[PDB]
UniProtKB/TrEMBL annotation, chain B:
A GO biological process held by the record: microtubule-based process
UniProt cofactor(s): Mg(2+)
Binding-site residues for GTP, renumbered to this chain: 11-12, 97-99, 138, 141-144, 176, 181, 204, 222, 226
Quaternary data: Dimer of alpha and beta chains. A typical microtubule is a hollow water-filled tube with an outer diameter of 25 nm and an inner diameter of 15 nM. Alpha-beta heterodimers associate head-to-tail to form protofilaments running lengthwise along the microtubule wall with the beta-tubulin subunit facing the microtubule plus end conferring a structural polarity. Microtubules usually have 13 protofilaments but different protofilament numbers can be found in some organisms and specialized cells.
Signal sequence residues: none
Protein name: Tubulin beta chain
Gene Ontology cellular component terms for the protein in this record: microtubule
A family per Pfam: Tubulin
Main location: cytoplasm
Protein function: Tubulin is the major constituent of microtubules, a cylinder consisting of laterally associated linear protofilaments composed of alpha- and beta-tubulin heterodimers. Microtubules grow by the addition of GTP-tubulin dimers to the microtubule end, where a stabilizing cap forms. Below the cap, tubulin dimers are in GDP-bound state, owing to GTPase activity of alpha-tubulin.
Taxonomic lineage: Eukaryota, Metazoa, Chordata, Craniata, Vertebrata
UniProt entry tagged with the keyword Zinc-finger: no
């Protein structure tokens, strides 16, 4: 049976983690105590799924998760919250102090003293596994833990495990909104290391999900408890073919192969088009054509970067629910007729499809509606080459005055590391420009 | 478990702390017998910051009280919340500083700082993990300046990897309460600028104007003024004692608010401050609080932020909110008022939210701003200083207790070499 | 415009490197210095105002020990007699060619033996009964932002290297309280003093070579010139002083690749903070010698603070950056070149 280890870091990954397991425990019938009152129906079978939950001989289901935060505020809310009886007590609070939004604290200085506890806890987790295929790291571009500890842990897992998928879900830093002055630095320092190890980093942007929650869900005052659920639905759409039956099943190494041409351009965006409420659940028929057209609207992306300021390289439409492949064929035919959606000359196919017969679940306390079908579009795009340029421009000013650098030097970073990290980024915009040029 | 050692030296510090330990208790449900008579259960979780456990489920605060006289120490005991402080921590002496910085730093403070460090090492080594030290003192009274700065130096020599956040009342422009405020303030600046991480500049005239224009208070005693400083001191440590959607702490705020290690002097501020009658006429929302906190009238530093550029602002929100609203508002401020912000630092604002607000508010806020306008406060003292030093007026009381003119020249030079650093980011130019 | 001049030197392969056929990763276009990876994917180009190709002994433009002195340090020896201060810095990592360039070998001397022979020779050719020249010196170290003297023996104990204090005299400027200021007549004195100091310096064995400089070393020469334009009354009234500092800085040492805890880490932090401030200062100085108004943060490191009057003003600064041409040590070289580029910018 397949297995996938989930590794949550920082306030953002741990808080995003709270929504993913809240969703999966409902998709599988598990209560927060770990028990499972669905087995009385069948008395056997595999309604529990070893891709996420290991099972004891007592009738309890334990997730394959590790929550490392280097601070106790968020993992204590799980230890006291509604899900205290689900997680194995080894949730690494550790955390005498946090990383203070500093790569230099989460990487070496305070990242040490805790990582060997994480790798030991991860080593225990893959020895209980038969068919381990992949890691799922949920972190944040901009923090200190989510920037440095992820880098360290990936550098260590590439050594230990090696030929294993490693998919990142990161909160991309937004152009306008920001909650810190040291996000550009930490982002460009995380990429420097993660780019040589990771295999596909799915980016999300809170400024986009805010506008989505505004225009489509009709929430004028949204918070993070609502966006984390959308992200849970994304990961549920990726992690569906490993749990539920379907027609075109998509394993995790398929994302590693049908979306990354070259081993540096692996930062695709993400969508989930039926983001409608129960009010507008009616007045809409929710067919594949409407959805596939929505996924390529510039608005309904979970990241803020116009796909029309660049070209598409690869796309991946994970369908779930009642879908017949003629509908997807017609949908994809409709996009190729459209000129706004422009494709690289070196990818005439450009699309992937994956269909699954289990539709998405509705959480109580949720803003999304019940739908007989749903879709997740994960696209690679040259548009991000601007976003990268924006971050580089933000880095170029502050580092021209050595602002905030003594806070990094004070915890074990050299000046040349900042310059070495910038160089690696200049050499990633040139790659996108090199990919956009037409053949001759 | 992140832990703060609170030190408070001098009548200003002793009478701000005496209000701070009255507020944190109310926030944690502790009584003057050190018991626990609260209702919620998040209080006891992270109470280890300020308080220490005792035998009968009693909580003693980590106060270290070192006023150089005996009157202030006696007032705290013969007082509301005085029967919880550790008796072996009421450190004092007789015949205080004499409004002299030197007596509190060389003559009469050197005979008493060892006895204080005996308590610091005894309340720090009883910690699983320490975050930093929290001083509340005055600039312009000798003892607070002197015996505070020497203590800062000794702790930053013993504990150099820890925060030393200071809450300092600065002298006011129009009217003074000592004729040697300039000298003592400069000499304390020379020992704080080099040995601090986040200093919070407070001024009593701005507090009087707050009490007058906003709270519609015409007889405000110092208890009313310290009631606002307690509020800010509390809000800095809310995301270390209560959960939140977006957490911070002393070091995160320091990292975000100090580009270069000497610009750690901040205008503080707190919202929602309102008159008792005008509270049924306005809505409690984030736009109201943003319009209150970014106003020059709610400063507590006696400096107009429109006479300069905000280098780096912060915001420690408290309550159930929507982080979109905070992000939108702290973007609108930086888009509209671009001239009041700095161009080489794209996002000048930090945000932080907690889920547990104060005892009677549906949401609160707190504000820390690094601004070039603070140079005014310094530019004034150096103008006073250089006058009184050009004629050696009140110096035969500073030299008598073992000092040189060099210690005045050095400090005056450092002050102007901070004015310069604040004024290098204060010109209206374009890219 | 030449308020600051940064020069870089490429030391030739070591005999072991020659035996190992270590790839060459630094090349010349005469002036440019290009650094090509062993993979040859990305190539990095640096340009400075002075470059010293000392890799071969046949290349047109070979910079020996006499092309270094004649190009960087002798103009500072001649900006002294005009009464104006000078500074020389030396940056580089272990194996880069710092000591070969500054001090040198017995067969091949560096800057210090040549400076302290040419100066005493110019004094044997300019001193008359009218004009007279006097030289003093000191030799101190920075260790975790604490000054320490090196030309004094210890007090026969486990640990005692006394921390001294920096103070701002109102007219002259920063200075040290307790600094030995010994007189000197020829190089035979400077050699003994330096040999006594460099053995009391701080040098540890981390995961690198087992002798790593964990301290900055400053070495001063105060030249006072007295002149008698005779008029009946008091004579030898004129007095012009010139400080000639010859500083030898330490290496950056990133801590991830060189796993350190405790004291070694605290040394690395200081060594990097100081160099950050120094590069910021050297940037901001040329930024004001090129038509601007800025502030120089002298007051962030004890080195930039005490050399305040010898770095800026009418002073003249020179700096040598040493780099290796092998692929075994290539991030050290990239960081070294990047530091000097920031200086030049
Ligand atoms: C129904 C109602 O709205 O009453 C409010 C009230 O009128 C106002 C004006 C309160 C009132 O505060 C003042 O009147 C005041 C006067 C001088 C100086 C400072 C405050 C209030 O006393 C203050 C008090 O605020 C609190 O409850 C907090 O817990 C506050 N309390 C204390 O600081 C405190 C001090 C000693 C002992 C116990 C508590 C607090 C604020 C920040 C951090 C921690 C605690 C409350 C609800 C009010 C009254 C009672 C009128 C305000 O207080 C603050 C700082 O939040 C003043 O403006 C705010 C807005 C409130 O609406
Ligand atoms: N979508 C989402 N984003 C979040 C959440 N919490 C924080 N973030 C984002 O994370 C960014 C800050 O990173 P943090 O996670 O706070 O940093 P960290 O990983 O917690 O590391 P620390 O420095 O130790 O706190 C901000 O830009 C937030 O928008 C969340 O619950 N959901
Ligand atoms: N905000 C506030 N400021 C005070 C208070 N008491 C004194 N001050 C200020 O602090 C200074 C008093 O100095 P102080 O340390 O008490 O003198 P000392 O007793 O000789 O050490 C004056 O400049 C006052 O402006 C108070 O209760 N509240
Ligand atoms: N330009 C050069 N020509 C010849 N040898 C050199 C040159 N530069 C460095 N070396 C050699 O490098 C060796 C060791 O380097 P060293 O001078 O000790 O630098 P460091 O003191 O920083 O280790 C010396 O034995 C010296 O011969
Ligand atoms: Mg955190």
């Amino acid at each position: 049976m397949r297995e996938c280890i989930s590794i949550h870091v920082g306030q953002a990954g741990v808080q995003i983690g709270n929504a993913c397991w809240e969703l999966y425990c409902l998709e599988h019938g598990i209560q927060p105590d770990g028990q499972m009152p669905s087995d009385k129906t069948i008395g056997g079978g595999d309604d529990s799924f070893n891709t996420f939950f290991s099972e004891t001989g007592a009738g309890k289901h334990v997730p394959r998760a590790v929550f490392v935060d280097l601070e106790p505020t968020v993992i204590d809310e799980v230890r006291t919250g509604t899900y205290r009886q689900l997680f194995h007590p080894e949730q690494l609070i550790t955390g005498k102090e946090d990383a203070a939004n500093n790569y230099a604290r989460g990487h070496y200085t305070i990242g040490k003293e805790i990582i060997d506890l994480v790798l030991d806890r991860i080593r225990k987790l893959a020895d209980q596994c038969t068919g381990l295929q992949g890691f799922l790291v949920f972190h944040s571009f901009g923090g200190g833990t989510g920037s440095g500890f992820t880098s360290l842990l990936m550098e260590r897992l590439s050594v230990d495990y090696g030929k294993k998928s490693k998919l990142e879900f990161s909160i991309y830093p937004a152009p306008q909104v920001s909650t810190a002055v040291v996000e550009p630095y930490n982002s460009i320092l995380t990429t420097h290391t993660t780019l040589e190890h990771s295999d596909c980093a799915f980016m999300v942007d809170n400024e986009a999900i805010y506008d989505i929650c505004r225009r489509n869900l009709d929430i004028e005052r949204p918070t993070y408890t609502n966006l984390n659920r959308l992200i849970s639905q994304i990961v549920s759409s990726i992690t569906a073919s490993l749990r539920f039956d379907g027609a075109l099943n998509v394993d995790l190494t398929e994302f590693q192969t049908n979306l990354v041409p070259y081993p540096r351009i692996h930062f695709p965006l993400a969508t989930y088009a039926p983001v409608i409420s129960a009010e507008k659940a009616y007045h809409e028929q929710l067919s594949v054509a409407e959805i596939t057209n929505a996924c390529f609207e510039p608005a309904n992306q979970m990241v803020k970067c116009d796909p029309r300021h660049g070209k598409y390289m690869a796309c991946c439409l994970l369908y779930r629910g009642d879908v017949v492949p003629k509908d997807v064929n017609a949908a994809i035919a409709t996009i190729k007729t459209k000129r706004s959606i422009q494709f690289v000359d070196w990818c005439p196919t450009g699309f992937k499809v994956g269909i699954n017969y289990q539709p998405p679940t509705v959480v109580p306390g949720g803003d999304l509606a019940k739908v007989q079908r749903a879709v997740c579009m994960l696209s690679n795009t040259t548009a991000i080459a601007e976003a990268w340029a924006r971050l580089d421009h933000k880095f170029d000013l502050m580092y021209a005055k050595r602002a905030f650098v003594h806070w990094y030097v004070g915890e074990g970073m050299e000046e040349g590391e900042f310059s070495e990290a910038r160089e690696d980024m200049a050499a990633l915009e040139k790659d996108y420009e090199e990919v956009g040029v037409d053949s001759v | 478990m992140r832990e703060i050692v609170h030190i408070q030296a001098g009548q200003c510090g002793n009478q701000i702390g005496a209000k701070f330990w009255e507020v944190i208790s109310d926030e944690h449900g502790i009584d003057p017998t050190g018991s626990y008579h609260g209702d919620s259960d998040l209080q006891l979780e992270r109470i280890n910051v300020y308080y220490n456990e005792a035998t009968g489920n009693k909580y003693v605060p980590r106060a270290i009280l070192v006023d150089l006289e005996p009157g202030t120490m006696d007032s705290v005991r013969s007082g509301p919340f005085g029967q919880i402080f550790r008796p072996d921590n009421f450190v004092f002496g007789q015949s205080g500083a004499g409004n002299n910085w030197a007596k509190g730093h060389y003559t009469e403070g050197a005979e008493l700082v060892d006895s204080v460090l005996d308590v610091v090492r005894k309340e720090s080594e009883s910690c699983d993990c320490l975050q930093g030290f929290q001083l509340t003192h005055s600039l312009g009274g000798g003892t607070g300046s002197g015996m505070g700065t020497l203590l800062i130096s000794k702790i930053r020599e013993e504990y150099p990897d820890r925060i030393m956040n200071t809450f300092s009342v600065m002298p006011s422009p129009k009217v003074s309460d000592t004729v040697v405020e300039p000298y003592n303030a400069t000499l304390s600046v020379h020992q704080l600028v080099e040995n601090t991480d986040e200093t919070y500049c407070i001024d009593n005239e701005a507090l009087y104007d707050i009490c007058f224009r906003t709270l519609k208070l015409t007889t405000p005693t110092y208890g009313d003024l310290n009631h606002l400083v307690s509020a800010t001191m509390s809000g800095v440590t809310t995301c270390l004692r209560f959960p939140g959607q977006l957490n911070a702490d002393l070091r995160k705020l320091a990292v975000n608010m100090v580009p270069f290690p000497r610009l750690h002097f901040f205008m503080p501020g707190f919202a929602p401050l309102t008159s008792r009658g005008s509270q049924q006429y306005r809505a409690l929302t984030v736009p109201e609080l943003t319009q209150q906190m970014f106003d020059s009238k709610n400063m507590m530093a006696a400096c107009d932020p429109r006479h300069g550029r905000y280098l780096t602002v912060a915001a420690i929100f408290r309550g159930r909110m929507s982080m979109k609203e905070v992000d939108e508002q702290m973007l609108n401020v930086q888009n509209k008022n671009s001239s009041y912000f700095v161009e080489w630092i794209p996002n000048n604002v930090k945000t932080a939210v907690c889920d547990i607000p104060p005892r009677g508010l549906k949401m609160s806020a707190t504000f820390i701003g690094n601004s070039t306008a603070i140079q005014e406060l310094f530019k004034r003292i150096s103008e006073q200083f250089t006058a009184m030093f050009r004629r050696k007026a009140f110096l035969h009381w500073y030299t008598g207790e073992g000092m040189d003119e060099m210690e005045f020249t050095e400090a005056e030079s450092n002050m102007n070499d901070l004015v310069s650093e604040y004024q290098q980011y204060q010109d209206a130019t374009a890219d | 415009n030449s308020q600051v001049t940064v020069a870089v030197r490429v030391r030739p392969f070591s005999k072991r490197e020659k035996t190992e056929k270590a790839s060459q990763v630094v090349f010349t276009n005469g002036e440019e210095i290009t650094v090509e990876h062993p993979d040859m994917k990305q190539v990095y180009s640096f340009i400075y105002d002075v470059s010293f190709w000392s890799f071969d002994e046949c290349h047109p433009g070979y910079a020996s020990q006499t092309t270094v002195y004649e190009t960087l340090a002798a103009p500072l020896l001649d900006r002294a007699f005009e009464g104006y201060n000078t500074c020389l810095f030396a940056y580089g990592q272990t194996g880069s060619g710092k000591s070969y360039t500054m001090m040198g070998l017995n067969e091949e001397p560096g800057i210090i033996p040549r400076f302290c022979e040419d100066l005493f020779a110019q004094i044997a050719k300019k001193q008359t009964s009218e004009v007279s020249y006097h030289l003093e010196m000191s030799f101190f170290e920075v260790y975790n932002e604490k000054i320490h003297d090196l030309l004094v023996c210890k007090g026969e104990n486990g640990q005692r290297k006394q921390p001294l204090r920096a103070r701002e005299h109102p007219v002259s400027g920063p200075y040290v309280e307790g600094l030995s200021m010994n007189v000197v007549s020829s190089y035979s004195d400077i050699q003994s003093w330096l040999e006594l100091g460099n053995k009391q310096r701080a040098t540890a064995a981390t995961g690198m070579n087992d002798k790593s400089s964990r301290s900055h070393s400053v070495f001063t020469l105060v030249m006072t010139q007295t002149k008698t334009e005779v008029v009946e009354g008091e004579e030898h009234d004129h007095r012009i002083t010139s400080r000639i500092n010859l500083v030898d800085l330490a290496g950056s040492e990133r801590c991830s690749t060189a796993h350190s805890s405790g004291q070694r880490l605290k040394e690395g932090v200081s060594i990097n903070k100081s160099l950050l401030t120094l590069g910021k200062v050297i940037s901001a100085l040329s930024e004001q010698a090129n038509g601007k108004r800025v502030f120089i943060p002298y007051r962030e490191s004890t080195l930039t603070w005490l050399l305040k009057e010898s770095l800026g003003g009418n002073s003249k600064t020179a700096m040598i950056a040493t780099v290796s041409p092998a692929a075994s040590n290539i991030e050290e070289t990239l960081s070294t070149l990047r530091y000097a580029t920031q200086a030049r910018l």
